[PDB]
Amino acid sequence: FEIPDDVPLPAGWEMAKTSSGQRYFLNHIDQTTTWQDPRK
Amino acid sequence: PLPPY
Known part of the structure; x- marks a missing residue:
């Protein structure tokens, strides 16, 4: 549902x-290093 | 690939 607006x-x-x-x-x-974030 | 920390 769309993207949140926190962090x-x-x-x-x-x-x-x-x-x-x-x-x-x-x-x-x-x-470690990831291109994407664990929380979106 | 990716930087291994």
């Missing part, structure tokens, strides 16, 4: 850039 990623998360020109999401909670 893209929870705490311990850092949207950053990897590969060459794509924004990833540096997961600090479990040390």
Whole structure:
């Protein structure tokens, strides 16, 4: 149902850039990097 | 692919 309007990623998360020109999401909670967010 | 932390 449409997109919410609160926060893209929870705490311990850092949207950053990897590969060459794509924004990833540096997961600090479990040390990892995902292009999409766990909560949309 | 993807940056391995």
